[PDB]
Amino acid sequence: GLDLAKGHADLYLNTIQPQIITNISNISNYFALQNAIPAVLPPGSTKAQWLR
Amino acid sequence: VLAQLNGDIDKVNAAIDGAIAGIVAGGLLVIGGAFVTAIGAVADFVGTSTPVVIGGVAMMVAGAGGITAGAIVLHNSLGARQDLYQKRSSLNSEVLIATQIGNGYKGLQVQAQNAVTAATQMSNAWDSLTSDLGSLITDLDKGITSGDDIRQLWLTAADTTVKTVLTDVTTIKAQIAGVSP
Amino acid sequence: ASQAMQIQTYCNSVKQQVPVDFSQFPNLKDNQTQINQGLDLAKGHADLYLNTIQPQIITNISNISNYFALQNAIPAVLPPGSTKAQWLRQLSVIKEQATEYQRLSSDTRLVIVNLNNNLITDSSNFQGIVVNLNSKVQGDNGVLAQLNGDIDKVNAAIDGAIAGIVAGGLLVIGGAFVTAIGAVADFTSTPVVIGGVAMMVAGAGGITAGAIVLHNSLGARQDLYQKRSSLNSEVLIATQIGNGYKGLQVQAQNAVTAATQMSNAWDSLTSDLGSLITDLDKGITSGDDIRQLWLTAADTTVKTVLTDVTTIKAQIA
Amino acid sequence: NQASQAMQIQTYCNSVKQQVPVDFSQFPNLKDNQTQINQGLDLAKGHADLYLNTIQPQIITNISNISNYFALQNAIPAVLPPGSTKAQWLRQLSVIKEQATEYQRLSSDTRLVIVNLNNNLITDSSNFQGIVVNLNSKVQGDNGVLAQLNGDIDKVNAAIDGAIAGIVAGGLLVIGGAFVTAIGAVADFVTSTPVVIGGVAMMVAGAGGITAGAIVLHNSLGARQDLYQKRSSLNSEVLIATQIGNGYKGLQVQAQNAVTAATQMSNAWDSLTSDLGSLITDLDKGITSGDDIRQLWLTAADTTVKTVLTDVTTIKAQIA
Ligand SMILES: [Cl-]
Ligand SMILES: [Cl-]
Ligand SMILES: [Cl-]
Ligand SMILES: [Cl-]
Ligand SMILES: [Cl-]
Ligand SMILES: [Cl-]
Ligand code: NA
Ligand code: NA
């Protein structure tokens, strides 16, 4: 019973926890892009470019 | 099991109490008897004083019996007693640990359930972002908004709320690294 | 103290312990084999950390730390004077490099997993030692209570024996006086010279009887208080070692926390390198302004990798 | 080291969510405490979740929106700004007044959310106090009983001491009698039946005492064991109630602290609402007033915006 429980703990510690931490990198990256958009499209740029 | 062990301990402790009682009683009979045996002996050297010389020697034999009997039972018992009290303390510890593991599982179950909630909230947060970007794409395409005012939205957000999210990211990473940002 | 300093402390501390010898206590034979096996293993783990893992972690991070110190940014636009051809090679070489470092980061994390399990094992074996000692002492205390009771009871036998001896002595002195008055009382008086000598014989009886019961009782009492002194010694040793292992247990538990924090720190580095790899790859295979988007994002991401590097370096010092 | 108001509620929430429901199925005397605790807990977790993923974000949102708008409009033009028709100036004031009115409503709405939060916390705090009280009364009861059991065990120990005394007495009579019986027997082979009877009498009496004592003993140890099982059971029950009790006492404190924090949040939002109201009044009375009276009200509105910004910083502080 105990051995199995430790198994469950390991799965959390070495499979799920990293996935959660990766999630923070993904959030960090999404916002890196979002704040880049207005830096690469100068003031007054095609609706076409913006949509891409 | 525990009930049996306690029973076994009660017997051994009783045996030992008994033995010691024998030894105290024994000693008194021997001293008492040696006095009776000595008076009865120099009363036969003058009637019918054998009735007390027997009683006196009876006491001494009984006494010496109790003493040597107690001594056997005692030296014999003492080793077993330690073994019994250790068995009990061991069983108590092991039952307690078995219970603790069970409680541990219950707790882990709760942690996992809380993790589901948390993960679900994360999915929904991403879904709002995607859907909200979709709305923005639609609004631009239909001509409700332009890249000139959308730019201002994002830069305002960069000045405040997005900057805040980025801060929280640094802070979270620090706290799970055990470091002071 | 840094995470590494905490594990380092635990390791140095565990290595300094001495194996136990409870051969004088048959009741602790099993605790001994448990403690010594546990200890031996723990020292193994400690050595591995001190001479293999800690240096390896410091190494891998130094290499990463240096590379990104140089490449502290990503050119998003096309630097002054380069064919687009050269720029794509320069981005591709960084992407390859980053991929190599991601793998190293990921490998470091596996090392750390192993470290965590070693620490968790040690912490656990120690908790077990304390528990098993506690239960032996709990047992000995039940017994000790009984022995104290048993000693109190026997003291009665000894008090009795001594009473017999004093009673005897008084009869002898009393009788010797009656025997002496009865002897100079013909001046008719053999009835009291008998009573006087009877007293003396009875007295001498009580004295030699009491002396047997006494030498016998003191022996039963001495036998009991030897068992007690033995149990007291055993309980004292178990407690001494117990407290030792309780302390070690704490150090180990703290080490687990520290190792777990290290894991998380490396996971951020790996994930963040992944983001950088993606951003570069999607920038290398994209349109003119889409390229700039991804490369700008990659530049933000490098700043993040540098942050992750400082964090790991902090954990170490 | 003192934590923000939101951090305090956040802590309580995270703390309550991590609790495990109890199972006192081994203790019939605690069946009611169990259903009370588990219901109380379940509800509390509900409240916690609501705070963590709905209310706290809502509060942070509303304040961000307010914070941004007034960051831009950090002042009120009390005179006619360089190059504008009086007509344009009145539109610019009217747009701010409309905007402020919108924010006042949002502030007021946030306050209702907080009221709800306060009641949730107050309910949780109360349910917890109740749990502790009901556990305490069960333990107070068990302690009355325990005292009696200890007394009862002390009494029975007499029966056991007696039984053992009987057995030792018996043994001595048998050994004593076997010696008398043996001397009386080889005194009849030298003429002594009066002592061979006395000797055998002793042996029979002794064997009687021994087998009698053995019954009384095995019987008494059983009565004592029956009593100390009830005691060990009560001790277990008292120990569990105390363990959980102390847990709920602690939770109760966390909740009480959370109430205080939520109440402080209420008061902070009340100041913002009232202060926005003052700003709305000052603008409205400045838009419909004389030349220098207009300037009075608009100057007052400008002071009032500074005040709104202060109120905003206060709320932001409460959150971080
Ligand atoms: Cl060994
Ligand atoms: Cl490596
Ligand atoms: Cl041990
Ligand atoms: Cl009950
Ligand atoms: Cl709202
Ligand atoms: Cl309750
Ligand atoms: Na170990
Ligand atoms: Na709530």
Side-chain angles (χ1 to χ4, degrees), chain A residues 21, chain C residues 56-62 64 101 104-106 108-109 112 261-272 308 312 315-316:
Chain A
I21 292 163
Chain C
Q56 192 146 50
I57 297 184
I58 293 164
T59 302
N60 297 353
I61 192 58
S62 302
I64 292 170
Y101 286 140
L104 178 61
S105 184
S106 175
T108 305
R109 165 137 179 74
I112 293 173
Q261 289 168 346
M262 239 154 210
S263 297
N264 300 160
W266 283 86
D267 281 332
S268 294
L269 179 56
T270 307
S271 291
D272 277 339
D308 299 345
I312 293 169
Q315 285 187 336
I316 284 166

PDB file of all heavy atoms in Angstrom, chain A residues 21, chain C residues 56-62 64 101 104-106 108-109 112 261-272 308 312 315-316:
ATOM      1  N   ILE A  21       5.737  23.714 -13.889  1.00  0.00           N
ATOM      2  CA  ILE A  21       6.814  24.686 -14.000  1.00  0.00           C
ATOM      3  C   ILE A  21       6.983  25.102 -15.466  1.00  0.00           C
ATOM      4  O   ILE A  21       7.252  26.258 -15.758  1.00  0.00           O
ATOM      5  CB  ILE A  21       8.114  24.132 -13.400  1.00  0.00           C
ATOM      6  CG1 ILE A  21       7.986  23.981 -11.885  1.00  0.00           C
ATOM      7  CG2 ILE A  21       9.285  25.020 -13.769  1.00  0.00           C
ATOM      8  CD1 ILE A  21       9.014  23.081 -11.236  1.00  0.00           C
TER       9      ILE A  21
ATOM     10  N   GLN C  56      29.463  18.408 -10.193  1.00  0.00           N
ATOM     11  CA  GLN C  56      28.836  18.245 -11.475  1.00  0.00           C
ATOM     12  C   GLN C  56      27.819  19.363 -11.699  1.00  0.00           C
ATOM     13  O   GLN C  56      27.735  19.926 -12.793  1.00  0.00           O
ATOM     14  CB  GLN C  56      28.186  16.857 -11.534  1.00  0.00           C
ATOM     15  CG  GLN C  56      27.725  16.429 -12.918  1.00  0.00           C
ATOM     16  CD  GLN C  56      27.909  14.933 -13.057  1.00  0.00           C
ATOM     17  OE1 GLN C  56      27.498  14.139 -12.204  1.00  0.00           O
ATOM     18  NE2 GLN C  56      28.615  14.555 -14.109  1.00  0.00           N
ATOM     19  N   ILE C  57      27.064  19.711 -10.651  1.00  0.00           N
ATOM     20  CA  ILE C  57      26.043  20.751 -10.761  1.00  0.00           C
ATOM     21  C   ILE C  57      26.725  22.095 -11.011  1.00  0.00           C
ATOM     22  O   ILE C  57      26.283  22.861 -11.898  1.00  0.00           O
ATOM     23  CB  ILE C  57      25.136  20.792  -9.515  1.00  0.00           C
ATOM     24  CG1 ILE C  57      24.354  19.483  -9.367  1.00  0.00           C
ATOM     25  CG2 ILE C  57      24.202  21.994  -9.554  1.00  0.00           C
ATOM     26  CD1 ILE C  57      23.364  19.498  -8.217  1.00  0.00           C
ATOM     27  N   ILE C  58      27.788  22.366 -10.236  1.00  0.00           N
ATOM     28  CA  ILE C  58      28.516  23.608 -10.360  1.00  0.00           C
ATOM     29  C   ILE C  58      29.142  23.694 -11.759  1.00  0.00           C
ATOM     30  O   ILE C  58      29.188  24.773 -12.347  1.00  0.00           O
ATOM     31  CB  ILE C  58      29.568  23.739  -9.253  1.00  0.00           C
ATOM     32  CG1 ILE C  58      28.919  23.884  -7.881  1.00  0.00           C
ATOM     33  CG2 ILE C  58      30.459  24.938  -9.543  1.00  0.00           C
ATOM     34  CD1 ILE C  58      29.820  23.636  -6.704  1.00  0.00           C
ATOM     35  N   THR C  59      29.635  22.564 -12.275  1.00  0.00           N
ATOM     36  CA  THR C  59      30.232  22.549 -13.599  1.00  0.00           C
ATOM     37  C   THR C  59      29.188  22.947 -14.655  1.00  0.00           C
ATOM     38  O   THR C  59      29.427  23.928 -15.464  1.00  0.00           O
ATOM     39  CB  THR C  59      30.787  21.175 -13.988  1.00  0.00           C
ATOM     40  OG1 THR C  59      31.769  20.754 -13.042  1.00  0.00           O
ATOM     41  CG2 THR C  59      31.409  21.211 -15.368  1.00  0.00           C
ATOM     42  N   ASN C  60      28.021  22.280 -14.598  1.00  0.00           N
ATOM     43  CA  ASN C  60      27.112  22.335 -15.759  1.00  0.00           C
ATOM     44  C   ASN C  60      26.608  23.771 -15.830  1.00  0.00           C
ATOM     45  O   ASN C  60      26.449  24.379 -16.920  1.00  0.00           O
ATOM     46  CB  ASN C  60      25.969  21.325 -15.686  1.00  0.00           C
ATOM     47  CG  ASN C  60      26.474  19.893 -15.704  1.00  0.00           C
ATOM     48  OD1 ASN C  60      27.664  19.656 -15.898  1.00  0.00           O
ATOM     49  ND2 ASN C  60      25.600  18.918 -15.518  1.00  0.00           N
ATOM     50  N   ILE C  61      26.424  24.341 -14.644  1.00  0.00           N
ATOM     51  CA  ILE C  61      25.912  25.668 -14.570  1.00  0.00           C
ATOM     52  C   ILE C  61      26.983  26.657 -15.023  1.00  0.00           C
ATOM     53  O   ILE C  61      26.624  27.629 -15.665  1.00  0.00           O
ATOM     54  CB  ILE C  61      25.336  26.018 -13.176  1.00  0.00           C
ATOM     55  CG1 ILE C  61      24.530  27.319 -13.230  1.00  0.00           C
ATOM     56  CG2 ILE C  61      26.416  26.104 -12.113  1.00  0.00           C
ATOM     57  CD1 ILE C  61      23.382  27.294 -14.228  1.00  0.00           C
ATOM     58  N   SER C  62      28.264  26.419 -14.714  1.00  0.00           N
ATOM     59  CA  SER C  62      29.336  27.315 -15.149  1.00  0.00           C
ATOM     60  C   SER C  62      29.360  27.432 -16.679  1.00  0.00           C
ATOM     61  O   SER C  62      29.448  28.577 -17.217  1.00  0.00           O
ATOM     62  CB  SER C  62      30.671  26.893 -14.655  1.00  0.00           C
ATOM     63  OG  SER C  62      30.660  26.832 -13.245  1.00  0.00           O
ATOM     64  N   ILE C  64      26.954  26.785 -18.826  1.00  0.00           N
ATOM     65  CA  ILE C  64      25.753  27.481 -19.285  1.00  0.00           C
ATOM     66  C   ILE C  64      25.937  28.975 -19.020  1.00  0.00           C
ATOM     67  O   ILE C  64      25.689  29.806 -19.869  1.00  0.00           O
ATOM     68  CB  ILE C  64      24.487  26.922 -18.607  1.00  0.00           C
ATOM     69  CG1 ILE C  64      24.210  25.488 -19.081  1.00  0.00           C
ATOM     70  CG2 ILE C  64      23.286  27.814 -18.847  1.00  0.00           C
ATOM     71  CD1 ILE C  64      23.133  24.750 -18.302  1.00  0.00           C
ATOM     72  N   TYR C 101      22.484  22.746 -24.401  1.00  0.00           N
ATOM     73  CA  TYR C 101      22.375  23.182 -23.015  1.00  0.00           C
ATOM     74  C   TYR C 101      21.067  22.728 -22.390  1.00  0.00           C
ATOM     75  O   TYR C 101      21.050  22.398 -21.231  1.00  0.00           O
ATOM     76  CB  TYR C 101      22.610  24.690 -22.950  1.00  0.00           C
ATOM     77  CG  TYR C 101      24.072  25.026 -23.136  1.00  0.00           C
ATOM     78  CD1 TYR C 101      24.495  26.115 -23.884  1.00  0.00           C
ATOM     79  CD2 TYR C 101      25.037  24.301 -22.447  1.00  0.00           C
ATOM     80  CE1 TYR C 101      25.843  26.424 -23.985  1.00  0.00           C
ATOM     81  CE2 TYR C 101      26.382  24.607 -22.545  1.00  0.00           C
ATOM     82  CZ  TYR C 101      26.787  25.687 -23.301  1.00  0.00           C
ATOM     83  OH  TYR C 101      28.107  25.977 -23.453  1.00  0.00           O
ATOM     84  N   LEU C 104      21.658  19.295 -21.276  1.00  0.00           N
ATOM     85  CA  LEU C 104      22.543  19.303 -20.087  1.00  0.00           C
ATOM     86  C   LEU C 104      21.724  19.681 -18.845  1.00  0.00           C
ATOM     87  O   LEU C 104      21.859  19.054 -17.798  1.00  0.00           O
ATOM     88  CB  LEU C 104      23.704  20.288 -20.301  1.00  0.00           C
ATOM     89  CG  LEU C 104      24.671  20.439 -19.116  1.00  0.00           C
ATOM     90  CD1 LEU C 104      25.354  19.110 -18.793  1.00  0.00           C
ATOM     91  CD2 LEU C 104      25.678  21.540 -19.379  1.00  0.00           C
ATOM     92  N   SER C 105      20.886  20.712 -18.964  1.00  0.00           N
ATOM     93  CA  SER C 105      19.989  21.146 -17.903  1.00  0.00           C
ATOM     94  C   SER C 105      19.113  19.956 -17.484  1.00  0.00           C
ATOM     95  O   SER C 105      19.083  19.584 -16.315  1.00  0.00           O
ATOM     96  CB  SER C 105      19.167  22.329 -18.359  1.00  0.00           C
ATOM     97  OG  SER C 105      18.350  22.841 -17.325  1.00  0.00           O
ATOM     98  N   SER C 106      18.461  19.326 -18.466  1.00  0.00           N
ATOM     99  CA  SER C 106      17.613  18.177 -18.238  1.00  0.00           C
ATOM    100  C   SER C 106      18.364  17.016 -17.547  1.00  0.00           C
ATOM    101  O   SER C 106      17.796  16.291 -16.715  1.00  0.00           O
ATOM    102  CB  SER C 106      16.998  17.734 -19.530  1.00  0.00           C
ATOM    103  OG  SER C 106      16.252  16.534 -19.333  1.00  0.00           O
ATOM    104  N   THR C 108      21.155  17.322 -15.622  1.00  0.00           N
ATOM    105  CA  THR C 108      21.410  17.811 -14.275  1.00  0.00           C
ATOM    106  C   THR C 108      20.179  17.493 -13.410  1.00  0.00           C
ATOM    107  O   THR C 108      20.296  16.971 -12.324  1.00  0.00           O
ATOM    108  CB  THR C 108      21.730  19.321 -14.273  1.00  0.00           C
ATOM    109  OG1 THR C 108      22.816  19.612 -15.154  1.00  0.00           O
ATOM    110  CG2 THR C 108      22.068  19.852 -12.902  1.00  0.00           C
ATOM    111  N   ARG C 109      18.987  17.765 -13.944  1.00  0.00           N
ATOM    112  CA  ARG C 109      17.772  17.497 -13.215  1.00  0.00           C
ATOM    113  C   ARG C 109      17.663  16.013 -12.829  1.00  0.00           C
ATOM    114  O   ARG C 109      17.218  15.706 -11.724  1.00  0.00           O
ATOM    115  CB  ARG C 109      16.538  17.969 -13.988  1.00  0.00           C
ATOM    116  CG  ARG C 109      15.242  17.394 -13.449  1.00  0.00           C
ATOM    117  CD  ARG C 109      14.067  18.344 -13.322  1.00  0.00           C
ATOM    118  NE  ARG C 109      12.975  17.539 -12.817  1.00  0.00           N
ATOM    119  CZ  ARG C 109      12.881  17.110 -11.564  1.00  0.00           C
ATOM    120  NH1 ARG C 109      13.804  17.477 -10.681  1.00  0.00           N
ATOM    121  NH2 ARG C 109      11.877  16.309 -11.231  1.00  0.00           N
ATOM    122  N   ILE C 112      19.793  15.307  -9.870  1.00  0.00           N
ATOM    123  CA  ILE C 112      19.125  15.874  -8.714  1.00  0.00           C
ATOM    124  C   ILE C 112      17.996  14.946  -8.244  1.00  0.00           C
ATOM    125  O   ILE C 112      17.798  14.788  -7.051  1.00  0.00           O
ATOM    126  CB  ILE C 112      18.686  17.310  -9.028  1.00  0.00           C
ATOM    127  CG1 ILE C 112      19.921  18.205  -9.213  1.00  0.00           C
ATOM    128  CG2 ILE C 112      17.744  17.860  -7.976  1.00  0.00           C
ATOM    129  CD1 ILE C 112      19.590  19.614  -9.702  1.00  0.00           C
ATOM    130  N   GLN C 261      14.120  22.178  -4.117  1.00  0.00           N
ATOM    131  CA  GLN C 261      14.227  23.534  -4.626  1.00  0.00           C
ATOM    132  C   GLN C 261      15.183  23.565  -5.814  1.00  0.00           C
ATOM    133  O   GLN C 261      14.969  24.295  -6.779  1.00  0.00           O
ATOM    134  CB  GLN C 261      14.674  24.490  -3.525  1.00  0.00           C
ATOM    135  CG  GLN C 261      13.578  24.722  -2.500  1.00  0.00           C
ATOM    136  CD  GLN C 261      14.047  25.419  -1.258  1.00  0.00           C
ATOM    137  OE1 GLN C 261      15.232  25.545  -0.996  1.00  0.00           O
ATOM    138  NE2 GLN C 261      13.095  25.808  -0.447  1.00  0.00           N
ATOM    139  N   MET C 262      16.252  22.775  -5.736  1.00  0.00           N
ATOM    140  CA  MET C 262      17.228  22.713  -6.819  1.00  0.00           C
ATOM    141  C   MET C 262      16.540  22.145  -8.062  1.00  0.00           C
ATOM    142  O   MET C 262      16.718  22.709  -9.115  1.00  0.00           O
ATOM    143  CB  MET C 262      18.483  21.908  -6.444  1.00  0.00           C
ATOM    144  CG  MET C 262      19.920  22.519  -6.470  1.00  0.00           C
ATOM    145  SD  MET C 262      21.094  21.580  -5.208  1.00  0.00           S
ATOM    146  CE  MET C 262      22.087  23.249  -4.965  1.00  0.00           C
ATOM    147  N   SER C 263      15.771  21.058  -7.924  1.00  0.00           N
ATOM    148  CA  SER C 263      15.003  20.461  -9.009  1.00  0.00           C
ATOM    149  C   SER C 263      14.183  21.509  -9.748  1.00  0.00           C
ATOM    150  O   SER C 263      14.308  21.674 -10.964  1.00  0.00           O
ATOM    151  CB  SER C 263      14.012  19.448  -8.501  1.00  0.00           C
ATOM    152  OG  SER C 263      14.637  18.355  -7.860  1.00  0.00           O
ATOM    153  N   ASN C 264      13.361  22.216  -8.977  1.00  0.00           N
ATOM    154  CA  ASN C 264      12.480  23.230  -9.511  1.00  0.00           C
ATOM    155  C   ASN C 264      13.274  24.319 -10.273  1.00  0.00           C
ATOM    156  O   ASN C 264      12.797  24.890 -11.274  1.00  0.00           O
ATOM    157  CB  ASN C 264      11.627  23.873  -8.408  1.00  0.00           C
ATOM    158  CG  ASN C 264      10.738  22.902  -7.682  1.00  0.00           C
ATOM    159  OD1 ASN C 264      10.311  23.209  -6.586  1.00  0.00           O
ATOM    160  ND2 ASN C 264      10.433  21.768  -8.300  1.00  0.00           N
ATOM    161  N   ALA C 265      14.473  24.646  -9.767  1.00  0.00           N
ATOM    162  CA  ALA C 265      15.261  25.703 -10.367  1.00  0.00           C
ATOM    163  C   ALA C 265      15.759  25.268 -11.751  1.00  0.00           C
ATOM    164  O   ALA C 265      15.797  26.069 -12.695  1.00  0.00           O
ATOM    165  CB  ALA C 265      16.403  26.073  -9.458  1.00  0.00           C
ATOM    166  N   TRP C 266      16.153  23.996 -11.844  1.00  0.00           N
ATOM    167  CA  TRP C 266      16.664  23.410 -13.077  1.00  0.00           C
ATOM    168  C   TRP C 266      15.503  23.235 -14.052  1.00  0.00           C
ATOM    169  O   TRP C 266      15.666  23.483 -15.233  1.00  0.00           O
ATOM    170  CB  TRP C 266      17.482  22.129 -12.799  1.00  0.00           C
ATOM    171  CG  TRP C 266      18.871  22.447 -12.286  1.00  0.00           C
ATOM    172  CD1 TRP C 266      19.239  22.674 -10.985  1.00  0.00           C
ATOM    173  CD2 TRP C 266      20.041  22.737 -13.063  1.00  0.00           C
ATOM    174  NE1 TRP C 266      20.554  23.034 -10.900  1.00  0.00           N
ATOM    175  CE2 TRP C 266      21.074  23.067 -12.163  1.00  0.00           C
ATOM    176  CE3 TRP C 266      20.326  22.703 -14.431  1.00  0.00           C
ATOM    177  CZ2 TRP C 266      22.360  23.374 -12.594  1.00  0.00           C
ATOM    178  CZ3 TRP C 266      21.604  22.991 -14.857  1.00  0.00           C
ATOM    179  CH2 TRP C 266      22.606  23.322 -13.947  1.00  0.00           C
ATOM    180  N   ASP C 267      14.327  22.872 -13.550  1.00  0.00           N
ATOM    181  CA  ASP C 267      13.129  22.737 -14.401  1.00  0.00           C
ATOM    182  C   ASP C 267      12.806  24.091 -15.072  1.00  0.00           C
ATOM    183  O   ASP C 267      12.468  24.129 -16.256  1.00  0.00           O
ATOM    184  CB  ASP C 267      11.933  22.192 -13.621  1.00  0.00           C
ATOM    185  CG  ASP C 267      11.972  20.691 -13.402  1.00  0.00           C
ATOM    186  OD1 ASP C 267      12.582  20.018 -14.266  1.00  0.00           O
ATOM    187  OD2 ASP C 267      11.404  20.197 -12.366  1.00  0.00           O
ATOM    188  N   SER C 268      12.918  25.200 -14.336  1.00  0.00           N
ATOM    189  CA  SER C 268      12.682  26.494 -14.938  1.00  0.00           C
ATOM    190  C   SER C 268      13.710  26.740 -16.053  1.00  0.00           C
ATOM    191  O   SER C 268      13.360  27.244 -17.122  1.00  0.00           O
ATOM    192  CB  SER C 268      12.713  27.617 -13.938  1.00  0.00           C
ATOM    193  OG  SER C 268      11.657  27.525 -13.015  1.00  0.00           O
ATOM    194  N   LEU C 269      14.975  26.381 -15.802  1.00  0.00           N
ATOM    195  CA  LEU C 269      16.026  26.624 -16.793  1.00  0.00           C
ATOM    196  C   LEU C 269      15.727  25.826 -18.070  1.00  0.00           C
ATOM    197  O   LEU C 269      15.777  26.392 -19.148  1.00  0.00           O
ATOM    198  CB  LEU C 269      17.402  26.238 -16.233  1.00  0.00           C
ATOM    199  CG  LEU C 269      18.570  26.430 -17.200  1.00  0.00           C
ATOM    200  CD1 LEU C 269      18.628  27.869 -17.708  1.00  0.00           C
ATOM    201  CD2 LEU C 269      19.875  26.060 -16.525  1.00  0.00           C
ATOM    202  N   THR C 270      15.422  24.530 -17.922  1.00  0.00           N
ATOM    203  CA  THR C 270      15.115  23.660 -19.037  1.00  0.00           C
ATOM    204  C   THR C 270      13.929  24.214 -19.840  1.00  0.00           C
ATOM    205  O   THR C 270      14.040  24.437 -21.045  1.00  0.00           O
ATOM    206  CB  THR C 270      14.803  22.229 -18.581  1.00  0.00           C
ATOM    207  OG1 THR C 270      15.836  21.703 -17.755  1.00  0.00           O
ATOM    208  CG2 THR C 270      14.570  21.295 -19.748  1.00  0.00           C
ATOM    209  N   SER C 271      12.801  24.450 -19.164  1.00  0.00           N
ATOM    210  CA  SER C 271      11.604  24.973 -19.822  1.00  0.00           C
ATOM    211  C   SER C 271      11.909  26.299 -20.556  1.00  0.00           C
ATOM    212  O   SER C 271      11.477  26.505 -21.698  1.00  0.00           O
ATOM    213  CB  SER C 271      10.479  25.134 -18.844  1.00  0.00           C
ATOM    214  OG  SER C 271      10.009  23.873 -18.397  1.00  0.00           O
ATOM    215  N   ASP C 272      12.670  27.183 -19.899  1.00  0.00           N
ATOM    216  CA  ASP C 272      12.994  28.483 -20.457  1.00  0.00           C
ATOM    217  C   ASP C 272      13.907  28.305 -21.680  1.00  0.00           C
ATOM    218  O   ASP C 272      13.746  28.996 -22.685  1.00  0.00           O
ATOM    219  CB  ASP C 272      13.453  29.425 -19.340  1.00  0.00           C
ATOM    220  CG  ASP C 272      12.284  30.080 -18.592  1.00  0.00           C
ATOM    221  OD1 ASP C 272      11.154  30.146 -19.132  1.00  0.00           O
ATOM    222  OD2 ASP C 272      12.496  30.535 -17.464  1.00  0.00           O
ATOM    223  N   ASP C 308      17.408  32.692 -14.638  1.00  0.00           N
ATOM    224  CA  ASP C 308      17.411  31.286 -14.175  1.00  0.00           C
ATOM    225  C   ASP C 308      18.837  30.867 -13.757  1.00  0.00           C
ATOM    226  O   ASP C 308      19.043  30.091 -12.816  1.00  0.00           O
ATOM    227  CB  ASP C 308      16.864  30.322 -15.236  1.00  0.00           C
ATOM    228  CG  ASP C 308      15.426  30.575 -15.646  1.00  0.00           C
ATOM    229  OD1 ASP C 308      14.738  31.315 -14.905  1.00  0.00           O
ATOM    230  OD2 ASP C 308      15.001  30.045 -16.699  1.00  0.00           O
ATOM    231  N   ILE C 312      20.141  29.634  -9.953  1.00  0.00           N
ATOM    232  CA  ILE C 312      20.877  28.405  -9.653  1.00  0.00           C
ATOM    233  C   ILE C 312      22.202  28.744  -8.951  1.00  0.00           C
ATOM    234  O   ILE C 312      22.581  28.114  -7.987  1.00  0.00           O
ATOM    235  CB  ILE C 312      21.062  27.570 -10.928  1.00  0.00           C
ATOM    236  CG1 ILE C 312      19.719  27.042 -11.422  1.00  0.00           C
ATOM    237  CG2 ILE C 312      22.028  26.423 -10.700  1.00  0.00           C
ATOM    238  CD1 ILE C 312      19.788  26.440 -12.795  1.00  0.00           C
ATOM    239  N   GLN C 315      21.541  29.423  -5.323  1.00  0.00           N
ATOM    240  CA  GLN C 315      21.313  28.158  -4.652  1.00  0.00           C
ATOM    241  C   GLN C 315      22.629  27.456  -4.263  1.00  0.00           C
ATOM    242  O   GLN C 315      22.688  26.713  -3.344  1.00  0.00           O
ATOM    243  CB  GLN C 315      20.575  27.181  -5.577  1.00  0.00           C
ATOM    244  CG  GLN C 315      19.098  27.434  -5.782  1.00  0.00           C
ATOM    245  CD  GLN C 315      18.495  26.283  -6.567  1.00  0.00           C
ATOM    246  OE1 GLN C 315      19.182  25.561  -7.315  1.00  0.00           O
ATOM    247  NE2 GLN C 315      17.198  26.066  -6.384  1.00  0.00           N
ATOM    248  N   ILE C 316      23.664  27.636  -5.060  1.00  0.00           N
ATOM    249  CA  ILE C 316      24.939  27.035  -4.824  1.00  0.00           C
ATOM    250  C   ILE C 316      25.816  27.832  -3.829  1.00  0.00           C
ATOM    251  O   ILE C 316      26.671  27.281  -3.185  1.00  0.00           O
ATOM    252  CB  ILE C 316      25.633  26.870  -6.178  1.00  0.00           C
ATOM    253  CG1 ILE C 316      25.045  25.696  -6.964  1.00  0.00           C
ATOM    254  CG2 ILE C 316      27.134  26.751  -6.033  1.00  0.00           C
ATOM    255  CD1 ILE C 316      25.461  25.689  -8.422  1.00  0.00           C
TER     256      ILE C 316
END
